[PDB]
Write a protein that binds this ligand. Structure first.
Ligand SMILES: *P(=O)(O)OC[C@H]1O[C@@H](n2cnc3c(N)ncnc32)[C@H](O)[C@@H]1O
Ligand SMILES: [Mn+2]
Ligand SMILES: [Mn+2]
Ligand SMILES: [Mn+2]
Ligand SMILES: [Mn+2]
Lengths: 439, 245, 252, 243
DNA sequence: CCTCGTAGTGCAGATGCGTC
DNA sequence: GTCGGACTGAT
DNA sequence: ATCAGTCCGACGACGCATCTGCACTACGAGG
């Protein structure tokens, strides 16, 4: 409430000047340590480059590349041709709009009848105005969007009104990601360098960041070891690793390893609280509406209670069971007309992991009990199946299965890890899961 | 808090001329009349509307009532009527508002009261150098003709004629000379030449069909003001800043 | 003087310029002893249009020597689309700049003047195709619009037959087929038939020709022959003529 | 088969409104009538149309088991080309259907016969605990204005008072129908409540042409019934489902 | 029957988005 | 995803 | 004097979506 947006711009001024990850991280803690409460969530949301996490089903901002030129022309009282010609030379629009607030000003109508007043803007009203511009549906929207955006531009300072343009763009070429933010927050609020792993786990638990920050600043550094996945906010996936086919992976393992199929197409994540079907994508996005046909297949055939399961969605040949490229599946997930082309595009799902069913955590248990318990909850049919769990013994056996996998389509084959060390990590790459593919 | 007005065709042009300039507005009911003042977001416009206590069918409000709304939603609830149907607005608690459409199969709507932030604005004392009182139907045609190709109009005057023309690739000209259907009043003062953006003039093209006489006034290094007059002494104003020059 | 012509009804001149703009974005004009006369042909040689205004309807005419005015109607198309008061007075004049169109109206009492940059030249002699046609009829305007609209749902070939004093129109393919009739005095006003022949005209060209006939409240004149082009003639509201030429496809 | 209707506007309208939930239908020929019955892909709305042996005059019957299907788009596109109150004739060939107008001149459109077979009629066997009847113009006007306010249409009834209510997060709407004012007569039954969709019932308002009166039966956790009274004891029905 | 004008309604013509 | 493309380290 | 882990902004060609503005076209008030 009593804050201003000048501080964030000033602290971002000295960010494209250092090239050491051990230096900018130290400086990043100052703003968080000095900022006030009840707006800390907004401050955290600002840095990454989003107004809010993208699993709440909120619409995307509509301001684009060529509309900013018009907005700047309106704000700075310059002809469209002039600003267009100036921008055509220098690519960075921020520098294009940089000088235009020092060599020219505006008058308007407020003052001809008599009025002289100006106050520094606040972060709260900036966030509120951005949120209002976000929705702006109506019928005559464009004039209600550009003019609404131009207010802050006409109520800005020369240094401040350079990163706002990039904010509208959606990318910040400054040198700050998310892991660096976590590490800086751990040092600042926590006070101990070694106390960053608990924060990392807590972030791995919940896909959001503002809620984690607010519960960290409300209860304290503690109350993090006992957070469990509710049916809702998801958990970030893990990634694989690629290499050649030497006597390397087997020497890493030693014996037989769990071998699965490398399906092609969109992945998925399911959260069914016995009443509703929630489906997520390879990133955070509510694809439930775009995928309404299979909300019943994952409901009635999976007999049980609330769970969190992971699988993959791949298009099939309409005539009979036959894999198809993800490019073909891309055709249907765009149009509102559903029951005219949906019935011609089969959607078959597979299952490869389970996360949280019996009201207790399972992400630390070894990767055999989870598979054994998941093997129970399944109904044999032609729409829900399970992965091709097979075991080989040597390199002279992988090729026999690899050739069949190639003949059956898909990108190839994938290996896994068996034993106590095979735990389901969140994020990162690791070396537990390894993939091999062709060109 | 009881207000009754007969026709809604009058309260459609005002609303569609207010939906194109702002996102929120406030209606102020007093012991004398109803006022409405609402700036624009970019501070390049001003539209004022006043309705007296003579068109209302013998109704009165005992105190103030700050009723807020959203332009799109209110304009969407004024498209129900087709013929000359009636309307009445009333409410008791300072939280909710009840709107009713009558005559045909009755309909009622419950509307929540939003909160709108507004700033202080002084009165209007803008004098100019011209008092043209040209017709109302010709202005719409002139604008829809000239402003279809250009992004800036030019308005120059003289002791005998009013010249409206665009420049650049095409030079079209329309005049309102004293010959047959032009001016009906003019002060000499001086000759002025100014410019205005072609987009801000389209937002007030549906406000025309309320009378048959406009009052175009402007001057050198001065804004643009136009005036309309209805029965009961209604007042509508529109102040527009000039171009960068 | 050198160039001074006047036309009573601007809602006919604008119709003429729209009709000639339906085939090109540039207009070539010549002012000589025959008044107003234009000419244009599509590059594919499938549609030809000739416009002639007789030198008696015009209220005023004063020239000095043959001259041409080569125009390019690109931005004036929308500007000229604001003619009202039905028969608003319009006159044409020349300038060293190239052209100046003046419009006078009485509903509101204003003026409309434009500046157009064009060069001068010399006129060209009258050129009209020579052909003889026997089968002919005169109908209204909307009938042609209906015939053009109903044919896009079957195919792109249009054939006309008038066997045994009965006019038949068939098109499409084997699966989807169209049948129509044109009897004596049932939909028609006047008729005169000598023999029978086929047309085999194109469909898009027919649609484009029909789209440029709105605004001429007069019984249109239509004729054709055997493996020969098609001619359509309409009369102006105040005075004038406009004859098209629909090319055939021979044995295609 | 050979039929003829002196009005080609109402029939075009009824086919247009039928062909908005379906994608493929099938005509049926019997000893005394022609019927159209089908179900929606969404498995929510069920509709059936019956036409007696007087709506279309000059009815000749060639065979007693004629079953002809049609693509939904082509028939609608062809019938869209109706000039004015003309006369239409339909004759059933072996594997095609020809539509010919009778106006200023003649017309002829030919469509191939497609193969389709699907008949899953859910039995009704219902006795609704409410009954009302009102004019078609009133219903059309009163539904064509509440469409753009939400999606959850809540139907509420009381003692001889049927109320339409649509409620959103920001504001709510309400309509009132009474026997004394504007709801004719025949209001009897019990007191119940339910809720239904919006788009499904909005799409059926295109019946302001071939209609004079309509009925309305509904209950609680029970499908709602809409019945339209065509001239000469003709009727068409629309069944919707609760939420 | 002859005039608006008012409103739908269909259709090209641009700009922004998410995916590797 | 992806190939860089830096950065940062431990004998 | 060198090989192994961590992290991070660009890659532009695209189907498809959503508003904007312009021709047609049926229909209801007033002479
Ligand atoms: P490709 O590299 O295009 O896609 C990578 C994603 O595919 C999922 N994936 C591959 N192979 C498997 C198996 N056998 N089981 C489960 N998931 C698989 C990975 O999750 C990658 O995210
Ligand atoms: Mn997103
Ligand atoms: Mn955008
Ligand atoms: Mn973007
Ligand atoms: Mn892949």
């Amino acid at each position: 409430s009593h804050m201003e947006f000048k501080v964030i711009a000033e602290y971002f001024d000295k960010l494209e000047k250092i090239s050491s990850r051990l230096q900018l991280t130290a400086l990043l803690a100052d703003l968080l340590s000095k900022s006030d409460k009840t707006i800390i969530d907004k401050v955290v949301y600002i840095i990454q480059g989003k107004l809010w996490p993208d699993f709440l089903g909120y619409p995307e901002l509509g301001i684009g590349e060529k509309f900013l030129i018009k907005a700047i022309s309106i704000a700075t009282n310059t002809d469209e041709n002039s600003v267009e010609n100036l921008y055509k030379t220098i690519g960075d629009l921020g520098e294009v709009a940089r000088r235009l607030k020092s060599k020219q000003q505006s008058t308007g109508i407020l003052g001809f009848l008599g009025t002289t007043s100006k106050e520094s803007l606040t972060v709260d009203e900036v966030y509120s105005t951005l949120s209002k511009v976000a929705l702006t549906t109506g019928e005559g929207s464009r004039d209600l969007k550009i003019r609404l955006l131009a207010g802050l531009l006409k109520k800005a300072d020369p240094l401040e009104a350079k990163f706002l343009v990039r904010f509208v763009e959606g990318r910040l070429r400054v040198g700050i990601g998310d892991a660096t933010v976590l590490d800086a927050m751990a040092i600042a609020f926590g006070g101990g360098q070694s106390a960053s792993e608990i924060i990392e786990r807590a972030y791995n638990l919940r896909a959001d960041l503002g809620n984690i920050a607010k519960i960290i600043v409300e209860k304290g550094i503690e109350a993090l070891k006992t957070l469990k996945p509710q049916v809702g906010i998801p958990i970030r996936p893990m990634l694989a690793e690629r290499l050649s086919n030497p006597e390397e992976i087997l020497k890493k393992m030693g014996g037989n390893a769990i071998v699965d199929y490398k399906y092609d197409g969109e992945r998925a994540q399911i959260h069914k609280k016995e009443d509703k079907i929630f489906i997520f994508s390879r990133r955070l996005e509510n694809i439930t509406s775009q995928y309404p046909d299979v909300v019943d297949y994952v409901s009635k055939y999976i007999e049980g209670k609330e769970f969190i399961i992971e699988g993959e969605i791949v298009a099939i040949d309409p005539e009979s069971g036959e894999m198809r490229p993800f490019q073909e599946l891309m055709h249907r997930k765009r149009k509102s007309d559903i029951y005219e082309a949906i019935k011609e595009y089969p959607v078959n799902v597979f299952l490869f992991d389970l996360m949280y069913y019996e009201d207790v955590d399972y992400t630390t248990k070894p990767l055999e009990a989870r598979r054994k318990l998941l093997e129970s909850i399944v109904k044999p049919n032609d729409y829900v199946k399970i992965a091709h769990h097979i075991q080989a013994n040597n390199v002279e056996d992988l090729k026999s299965f690899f050739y069949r996998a190639i003949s059956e389509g898909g990108e190839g084959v994938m290996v896994k890890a068996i034993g106590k060390d095979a735990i389901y990590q969140a994020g990162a790459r690791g070396w537990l899961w390894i993939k091999l593919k062709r060109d | 808090m009881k207000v009754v007005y007969d026709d809604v065709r009058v309260l459609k042009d005002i609303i569609q001329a207010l939906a194109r300039l702002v996102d929120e507005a406030v209606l102020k009911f007093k012991q004398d009349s109803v006022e409405l003042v609402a700036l624009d977001r970019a501070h390049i416009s001003l539209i004022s509307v006043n309705l007296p206590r003579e068109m209302f069918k013998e109704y009165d409000v005992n105190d103030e009532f700050k009723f807020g709304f959203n332009t799109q939603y209110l304009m969407k609830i004024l498209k129900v009527a087709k013929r000359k149907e009636a309307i009445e607005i009333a409410s008791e608690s300072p939280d909710s508002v009840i709107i009713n459409i009558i005559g045909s199969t009755n309909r009622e709507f419950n509307v929540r009261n939003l909160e709108v932030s507004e700033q202080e604005i002084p009165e209007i004392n803008l004098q100019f150098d011209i008092s043209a009182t040209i017709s109302s139907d010709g202005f719409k045609s002139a604008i829809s003709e000239v402003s279809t190709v250009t992004d800036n109009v030019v308005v120059e005057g003289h002791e005998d004629r009013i010249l409206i023309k665009a420049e650049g690739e095409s030079e079209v000209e329309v005049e309102f000379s004293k010959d047959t259907g032009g001016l009906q009043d003019l002060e000499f003062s001086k000759e002025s030449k100014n410019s205005y953006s072609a987009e801000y003039l389209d937002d007030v093209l549906s406000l025309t069909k309320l009378s048959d006489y406009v009052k175009i006034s402007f001057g050198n290094q001065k804004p643009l003001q136009l005036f309309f007059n209805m029965e009961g002494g209604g007042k509508v104003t529109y102040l527009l800043a000039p171009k960068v020059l | 003087m050198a160039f001074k012509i006047v036309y009573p009804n601007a809602k006919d001149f604008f119709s003429f310029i729209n009709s000639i703009t339906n085939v090109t974005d540039s207009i070539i004009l010549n002012f000589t002893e025959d008044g107003i006369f234009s000419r244009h042909l599509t590059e594919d040689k499938v549609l030809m249009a000739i416009m002639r205004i007789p030198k008696d309807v015009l209220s005023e005419y004063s020239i000095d020597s043959p001259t041409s005015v080569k125009l390019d109607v690109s931005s004036v198309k929308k500007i000229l689309s604001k003619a009202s008061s039905k028969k608003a007075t319009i006159e044409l004049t020349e300038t060293d700049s190239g052209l100046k169109i003046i419009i006078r109206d009485e509903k509101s009492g204003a003026k409309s003047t434009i500046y157009i940059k064009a060069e001068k030249g010399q006129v060209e002699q009258l050129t009209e195709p020579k052909v003889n046609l026997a089968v002919n009829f005169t109908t209204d305007e909307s009938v042609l619009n209906v015939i053009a609209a109903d044919v896009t749902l079957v195919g792109e070939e249009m054939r006309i037959s008038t066997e045994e004093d009965k006019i038949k129109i068939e098109a499409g393919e084997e699966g989807k087929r169209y049948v129509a009739f044109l009897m004596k005095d049932k939909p028609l006003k006047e008729l005169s038939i000598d023999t029978s022949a086929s047309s085999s005209y194109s469909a898009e060209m027919f649609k484009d020709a029909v789209k440029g006939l709105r605004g001429f409240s007069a019984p249109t004149m239509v004729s054709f022959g055997e493996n020969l082009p098609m001619k359509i003639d309409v009369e102006a509201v105040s005075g004038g003529h406009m004859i098209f030429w629909i090319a055939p496809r021979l044995l295609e | 088969m050979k039929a003829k209707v002196i009005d080609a506007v109402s029939f075009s309208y009824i086919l247009r409104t039928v062909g908005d939930f379906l994608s493929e239908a099938n005509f049926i020929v019997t000893k005394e009538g022609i019927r159209v019955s089908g179900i929606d892909p969404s498995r929510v709305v069920f509709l059936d149309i019956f036409l007696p042996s007087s709506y279309f005059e000059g009815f000749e019957v060639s065979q007693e088991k004629e079953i002809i299907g049609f693509k939904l788009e082509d028939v609608n596109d062809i019938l869209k080309r109706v000039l004015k109150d003309d006369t239409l004739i339909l004759s059933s060939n072996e594997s095609k259907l020809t539509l010919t107008f009778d106006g200023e001149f003649t017309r002829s459109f030919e469509l191939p016969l497609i193969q389709v077979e699907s008949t899953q009629p859910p039995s009704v066997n219902l006795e609704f605990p409410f009954k009302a009847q009102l004019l078609t113009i009133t219903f059309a006007d009163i539904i064509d204005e509440l469409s753009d306010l939400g999606e959850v249409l809540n139907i509420h009834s009381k003692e001889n008072k049927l109320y339409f209510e649509v409620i959103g997060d920001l504001s709510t709407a309400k309509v009132e129908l009474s026997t004394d004012n504007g709801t004719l007569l025949e209001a009897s039954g019990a007191d119940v409540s339910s809720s239904y969709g919006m788009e499904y019932v909005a799409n059926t308002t295109k019946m302001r042409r071939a209609s004079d009166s309509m009925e309305l039966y509904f209950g609680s956790q029970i499908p709602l019934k809409l019945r339209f009274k065509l001239p000469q004891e003709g009727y068409g029905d629309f069944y919707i489902a609760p939420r």
